[PDB]
């Protein structure tokens, strides 16, 4: 064999990326015989050769890319060189663009097949379905195919743009909310899209000291891993009353151990069974979700619904791992959503104003303080912001909060306050 | 006319399956059939079952066109992906659902699975969410595609059915930048280095900014050197976090040798039961063993299984070390505590500890 | 000849009472009578009362002698103080317990006091450790022993008498150098300034040590200005510890009118139930009002009495918090949370809330 | 009135401190007149005359002071001066005397009558039972006066040296342990006395980069509140199975309500009650000591004894405050307790030889790493040092834990080893 290291992952029952790649070759290699227009033919064979010296290598065979784009637009497209151009030269280049995909991951079969008729004539054949950030990923093209393909996506009967990369407003992206699941507390993939569209220009043409992330999540499960992948994580959560159909609940008294399974688990113990009728304690609920996820035929999210906004999750790099934290606790989400906008615009401008380069919004908000942060976004201190006050005394007092007094004075007639 | 330009994704309404979309927003319940296998019933009285396959998320054209035709054939070609890159089709005739699973399986091989049933308390292992490695990244320190289908390759029977007792993900970050929710895991694999960078002058004085190049090194590990306008590392300071290379191709810290991975566990995102958690460092470093990562694999069996077989029904890796404390959760898992084990990350303030991280909070 | 020095304290074991002496280190249990007195019963046999009263800390030598003359007649030439400041007295005589009350406030005007009853679970409320003060301290920022009189004073009766549901302290410091337990009390008066200092240039030339000042302020506002050779301020970067006025007498930071103290809560020592934890703020200032403090007195018992009343049997206030929560921790004390109460002390590593503060793990 | 203010203070039924100083000068200026040898009887007058202006100006008259001493000691003495020095001439010198403390604060009644006649004789007739570190607190006397003191303390029938302050070792202290507690895992008197001598240089001579406390716990009850106000605290704790007499435990649930008061509240569920046995679960028991406080008639500590040592507990200057955490999970404690004393030297010399200018210990191990500490100790890392391990993965290693590489090679090159 030529890949005897790779062959060895095509043993085993889990579905092999190697195969998936070995039948892309197949394939656009054979394209290419029948006289189809397919621009990189033998781009993924030079792929795995690549990737089966970096096997027996135990090292990477990229090296730092130059800049590339598309025409009109600033970031969407990752450059990538290969340090093996020479021996390998199919991938001397193999660039990514990544392409915006519809809110919550759904497609009709028409559209999939337009996206791999343009990236079939255009690119390598290999794509990842999807990039963490939500993204479908078009993995391996050279810099001169980058135009003629964003311009062949943007004419096709369903058309598709490129998303974020960079120092931008990246690709949104949501839970399948309301198309699919009865917890969600707003609309998910409208708010998703709404935002996508709102802010072409801030997503393609970075501007900014850094990247920010906003990922929209239906209700507190979380199932886009908003508050850990995202710097402006929107939460569904509600304020009033969990509906109870108090039959349903008997309906599973009858063969699940409530007590355990549910009752003891709560959080704060707001649930109380009895054999006969079961109540939440609202006013102890902290909307945790776990009773709805165990009885989802008798249990549901209140009525007065909204969202929880937490700010500043991010990866480790520069000052440590963050899973956000509240920053609103409570705004309405309905169209055209212009309370988030405004919250939005307001940070944007701040951290435009006052970041450092690569500084990202949870790190400008730990550098200039949450009252600042409050400040510019019009909202006041709010307990639920904090887990516990302060540990320590050592408080900054508004000039405005202090007695008149001949100390303030002299403060004056130094300068300095 | 000019080419076209900020137009954005296809509005996704129009790529809904008409059931779904007539019922958007109306939904009375869900209910899990069998692994794989999720029946959703809306107000108006329509069923449907969603059907969930385990990919390489890597996926050829030809293998996107393949799903199209199966689409066409059994879900009236509409089909979704999840947030772990398991792939999605909706099937209103319920007498068709084994046809379908059995013709996924024949002509992709990818498997009926990765759901789970909080009902019953049943849960199964998803998909691995995970990035480039060597396929694509600069700055791996370790693969993410082999070391993904090595470690579901031991973990298969897993994914096909509902055999573990609460939710465990496993999540996979090539290098010390994440890419993914991987610091919030039950179980995260993250490549690290072990050695320091070694500045390469001449790359540094043609390509590299040299302010930002120090301002990105957390622990002040890097000076100017103004004399020979290039950066020095002091090498007591750095730990081999590799955040300058990211900056500066001048400084590659990269040894075959010495790369290996960190296992973390005990992450959480959802809020049911349990505030979420950033995960935690168990096992400091195994090596790269190419294509089937011996090592690694066999204490990432470890770890699962010493909690599967102790994790009583709902409670998580960090809800059982929330039980049992982290003196018997390394002896029960047979693994050691080290020095490395102790934070030492400096930067990181203790006030964020004190923010509530969570959306849960008492109105 | 020269003096007689590096003698150390007189050997304890030689200031012990015949009976304690006899019985040290063996004792079979221990017994709380009624408020302020203790029976200890030893394997021997022979029993003790060990009887406690307040002291106001500060004594004059004369309220010395005094002492040990009742202490001759009552506890055979013995006595002792305790961690708070209260003096122990040793009747083994079990009819001249309750002549000796009268008989010592009858002379000092101690009351009898300071006990708990973990066994019953009724308590009362100790000591009030604090610090100097005006008295003699050179950097407070209010009066430690004139609080403490006011606040014991309007407090008096849980002192005399077992009315709490849970161990309480109170304690204090006159400035944010926190001497004392006052990092880590239930509840904690914390002497603040609300003003930056202003600098006398012409006091820093001919004292001060301008590179140690700068290295002693926390959030780095110090800077050497090198003309004029003096120290200048960054009025945005100062939270007014005073800790440059500690280093350097040419930066008052004193504004009579602005300084005051902040009120903490929920710190605990003891491992009993759930582990130790530090102080937090609930109330950013209260003014200076010599000679009575009605501000402070009047927040501080507000804050007590609503933990009072909620209480459970050993549900300390920190345990009281764990249990409501605090969105209804302010509600029932009727304080707001206002913006100086999110952390934002920069310098310490969030590793420290990692670290094991306790004495509680397995073997 | 010659004092307005302070005379509010006198009413009241806590023992008022306002009286004190009264009947401090009025007696002192008494004995004065009768011929008696008292050097100070004026300074008790100065110190309310002082306070009354202090009362109604809202603001301390005490200033920066010079460093004063006695001779062949570096530290005992607080140096004080007050801005009022011409205004009232008796509190232009108002020095404090540290005075160590018997172990306990246990005393005799000639022990006590023997201070008080030394101090009436050289200052002010006022002090303080106790300082907070512990030591007899003489307060104000004068320069002069401060010599012929120290050596009549020496002289005295029982006598006393001076405790510490500075960057010294400060007066160790200790709670009550065996005089009087059943709880006593060690003997605490003996090892704060036997601490006191050994080191009497230490505490006398600062040398130190900054100040260093110890403080003697009976058992993890904590009441020196070692935890918080030493840097190095000695908590006892034992290895076996608490200790439980079962006819005493039914004594007990006749009338306690075990189930509640002390079932329900274990942090680890290691205790249960059925009704005619109470059963202790030692591994799962983290020796919180709330059992053994609700039922001292039926419930003892273990018979292996020894304690566990806590590390860098102190005040918030400069880098927080701080509840020390687990250096030493367990240590034997037997006379003359040289495993400690290994440690404690250990400590300094390092301390002593790295630390920077007022570093307390806690904040040098912040600064160089747990590791260095562990290796200075010459111990183990150990899960008990811990609330959890590190949540990211920047780790140093050790040069030999490293596998010999081409890459390990051209570091040794370079000399970057
Ligand atoms: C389909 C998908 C959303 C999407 O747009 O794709 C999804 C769909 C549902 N999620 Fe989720 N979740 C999905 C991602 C997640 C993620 C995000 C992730 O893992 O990266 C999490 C947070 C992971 C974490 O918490 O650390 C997530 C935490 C949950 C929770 C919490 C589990 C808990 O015990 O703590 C529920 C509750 C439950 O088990 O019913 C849940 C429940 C559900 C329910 C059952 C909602 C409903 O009422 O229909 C959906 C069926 C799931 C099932 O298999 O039982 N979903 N869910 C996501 C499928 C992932 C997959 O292929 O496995
Ligand atoms: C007299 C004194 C010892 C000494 O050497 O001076 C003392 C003596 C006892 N303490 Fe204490 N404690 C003494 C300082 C403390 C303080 C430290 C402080 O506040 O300065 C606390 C730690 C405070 C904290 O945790 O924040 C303390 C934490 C305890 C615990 C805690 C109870 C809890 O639920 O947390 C026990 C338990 C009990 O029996 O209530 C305790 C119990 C005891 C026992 C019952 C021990 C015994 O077996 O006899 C002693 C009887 C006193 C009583 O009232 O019940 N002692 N004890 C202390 C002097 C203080 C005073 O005058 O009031
Ligand atoms: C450009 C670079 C490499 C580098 O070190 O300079 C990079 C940078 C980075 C680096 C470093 C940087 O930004 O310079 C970090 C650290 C940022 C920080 O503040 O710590 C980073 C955190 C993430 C994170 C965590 C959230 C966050 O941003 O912190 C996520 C998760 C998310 O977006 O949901 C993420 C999602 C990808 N990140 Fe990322 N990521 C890269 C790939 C990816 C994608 C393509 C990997 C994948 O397999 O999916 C993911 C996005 C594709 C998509 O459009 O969907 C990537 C190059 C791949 C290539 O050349 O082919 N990266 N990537
Ligand atoms: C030297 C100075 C202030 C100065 O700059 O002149 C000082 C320094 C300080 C300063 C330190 C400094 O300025 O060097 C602070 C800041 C400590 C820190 O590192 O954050 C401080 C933490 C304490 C602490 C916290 C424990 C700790 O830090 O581990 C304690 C508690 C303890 O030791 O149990 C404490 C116990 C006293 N501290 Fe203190 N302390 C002073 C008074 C006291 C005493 C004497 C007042 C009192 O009687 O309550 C306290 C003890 C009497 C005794 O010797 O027994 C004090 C002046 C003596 C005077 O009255 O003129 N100080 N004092
Ligand atoms: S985040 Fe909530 S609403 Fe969204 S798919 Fe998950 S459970 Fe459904
Ligand atoms: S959502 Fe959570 S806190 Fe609310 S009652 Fe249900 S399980 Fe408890
Ligand atoms: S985790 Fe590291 S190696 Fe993997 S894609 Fe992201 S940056 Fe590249
Ligand atoms: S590898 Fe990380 S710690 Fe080391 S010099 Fe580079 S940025 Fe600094
Ligand atoms: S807390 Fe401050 S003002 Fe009070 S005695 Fe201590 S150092 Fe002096
Ligand atoms: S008062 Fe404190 S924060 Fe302000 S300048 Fe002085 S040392 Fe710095
Ligand atoms: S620490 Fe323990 S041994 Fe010492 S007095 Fe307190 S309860 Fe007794
Ligand atoms: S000492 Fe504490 S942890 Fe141990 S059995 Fe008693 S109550 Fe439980």
């Given at each position: 064999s030529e890949t005897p290291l790779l062959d060895e992952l095509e043993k085993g029952p889990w579905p092999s990326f190697v195969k998936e790649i070995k039948k892309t070759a197949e394939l656009m290699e054979?394209?290419?015989?029948?006289?189809?227009?397919?621009?990189?033919?033998?781009?993924?064979?030079?792929?795995?050769?690549?990737?089966?010296?970096?096997?027996?290598?135990?090292?990477?065979?990229?090296?730092?890319?130059?800049?590339?784009?598309?025409?009109?637009?600033?970031?969407?497209?990752?450059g990538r060189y290969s340090d093996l151009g020479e021996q390998?030269?199919?991938?001397?280049?193999?660039?990514?663009?990544?392409?915006?995909?519809?809110?919550?991951?759904?497609?009709?079969?028409?559209?999939?097949?337009?996206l791999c008729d343009v990236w079939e004539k255009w690119g390598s054949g290999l794509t990842n379905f999807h990039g963490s950030t939500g993204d479908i990923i078009f993995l391996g093209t050279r810099s001169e195919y980058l135009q003629p393909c964003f311009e062949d996506l943007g004419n096709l009967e369903i058309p598709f743009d490129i998303g974020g990369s960079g120092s931008d407003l990246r690709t949104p992206s949501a839970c399948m909310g309301p198309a699919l699941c009865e917890f969600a507390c707003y609309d998910t993939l409208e708010?998703?899209?709404?935002?996508?569209?709102?802010?072409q220009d801030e997503l393609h043409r970075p501007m900014w000291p850094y990247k920010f992330k906003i990922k929209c999540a239906g209700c507190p499960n979380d199932c886009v891993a908003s508050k850990a992948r995202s710097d402006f994580a929107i939460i569904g959560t509600w304020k009033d009353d969990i509906k109870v159909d108090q039959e349903a609940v008997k309906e599973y008294a009858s063969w699940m151990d409530i007590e355990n399974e549910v009752v003891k688990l709560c959080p704060t113990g707001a649930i109380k069974w009895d054999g006969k009728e079961l109540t939440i304690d609202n006013r102890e609920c902290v909307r945790c979700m776990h009773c709805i996820n165990?009885?989802?035929?008798?249990?549901?999210?209140?009525?007065?619904?909204?969202?929880?906004?937490?700010?500043?999750?991010?990866?480790?790099?520069?000052?440590?791992?963050?899973?956000?934290?509240?920053?609103?606790?409570?705004?309405?989400?309905?169209?055209?959503?212009?309370?988030?906008?405004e919250i939005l615009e307001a940070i944007w401008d701040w951290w435009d104003e006052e970041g450092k380069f690569r500084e990202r919004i949870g790190e400008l908000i730990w550098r200039k303080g949450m009252?600042?942060?409050?400040?510019?976004?019009?909202?006041?201190?709010?307990?639920?912001?904090?887990?516990?006050?302060?540990?320590?005394?050592?408080?900054?007092?508004?000039?405005?909060?202090?007695?008149?007094?001949?100390?303030?004075?002299?403060?004056?007639?130094?300068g300095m306050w | 006319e000019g080419v076209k330009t900020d137009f954005g994704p296809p509005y996704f309404r129009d790529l809904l399956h008409p059931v779904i979309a007539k019922n958007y927003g109306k939904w009375k319940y869900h209910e899990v059939v069998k692994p794989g296998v999720i029946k959703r019933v809306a107000e108006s009285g329509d069923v449907i079952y969603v059907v969930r396959f385990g990919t390489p998320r890597l996926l050829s054209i030809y293998t996107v066109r393949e799903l199209c035709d199966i689409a066409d054939k059994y879900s009236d070609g509409y089909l979704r992906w999840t947030s772990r890159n398991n792939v999605e089709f909706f099937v209103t005739d319920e007498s068709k659902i084994d046809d379908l699973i059995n013709e996924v399986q024949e002509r992709v091989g990818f498997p009926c699975g990765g759901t789970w049933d909080a009902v019953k308390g049943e849960y199964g292992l998803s998909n691995i969410?995970?990035?480039?490695?060597?396929?694509?990244?600069?700055?791996?320190?370790?693969?993410?595609?082999?070391?993904?289908?090595?470690?579901?390759?031991?973990?298969?029977?897993?994914?096909?059915?509902?055999?573990?007792?609460?939710?465990?993900?496993?999540?996979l970050a090539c290098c010390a930048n994440m890419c993914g929710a991987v610091h919030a895991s039950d179980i995260a694999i993250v490549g690290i280095h072990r050695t320091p960078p070694i500045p390469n002058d001449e790359a540094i004085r043609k390509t590299c900014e040299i302010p930002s190049t120090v301002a990105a090194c957390p622990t002040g590990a890097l000076k100017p050197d103004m004399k020979n306008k290039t950066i020095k590392v002091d090498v007591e300071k750095c730990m081999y976090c590799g955040n300058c290379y990211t900056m500066c191709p001048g400084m590659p810290l990269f040894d075959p040798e010495n790369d290996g991975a960190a296992i973390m566990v005990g992450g959480k995102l959802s809020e049911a039961r349990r505030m979420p958690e950033l995960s935690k460092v168990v096992v400091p470093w195994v090596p790269n063993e190419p294509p089937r990562w011996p090592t690694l694999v066999k204490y990432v069996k470890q770890i699962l299984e010493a909690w599967a077989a102790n994790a009583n029904k709902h409670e998580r890796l960090i809800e059982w070390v929330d039980r049992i404390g982290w003196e018997r959760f390394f002896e029960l898992t047979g693994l050691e505590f080290t020095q490395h084990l102790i934070d030492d990350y400096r930067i990181t303030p203790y006030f964020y500890s004190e923010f509530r991280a969570s959306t849960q909070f008492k109105w």
């Open positions: 054979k394209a290419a015989a029948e006289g189809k227009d397919v621009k990189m033919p033998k781009g993924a064979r030079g792929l795995l050769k690549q990737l089966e010296i970096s096997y027996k290598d135990k090292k990477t065979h990229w090296k730092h890319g130059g800049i590339v784009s598309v025409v009109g637009y600033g970031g969407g497209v990752i390998i030269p199919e991938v001397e280049h193999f660039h990514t663009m990544r392409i915006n995909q519809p809110s919550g991951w759904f497609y009709s079969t028409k559209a999939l097949r337009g708010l998703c899209y709404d935002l996508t569209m709102t802010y165990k009885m989802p035929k008798a249990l549901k999210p209140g009525d007065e619904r909204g969202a929880t906004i937490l700010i500043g999750g991010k990866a480790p790099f520069v000052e440590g791992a963050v899973i956000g934290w509240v920053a609103v606790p409570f705004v309405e989400v309905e169209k055209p959503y212009d309370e988030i906008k009252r600042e942060f409050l400040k510019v976004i019009g909202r006041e201190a709010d307990v639920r912001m904090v887990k516990a006050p302060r540990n320590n005394p050592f408080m900054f007092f508004e000039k405005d909060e202090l007695k008149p007094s001949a100390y303030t004075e002299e403060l004056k007639k130094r | 969410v995970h990035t480039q490695g060597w396929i694509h990244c600069h700055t791996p320190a370790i693969d993410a595609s082999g070391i993904v289908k090595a470690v579901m390759d031991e973990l298969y029977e897993y994914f096909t059915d509902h055999k573990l007792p609460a939710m465990c993900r496993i999540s």
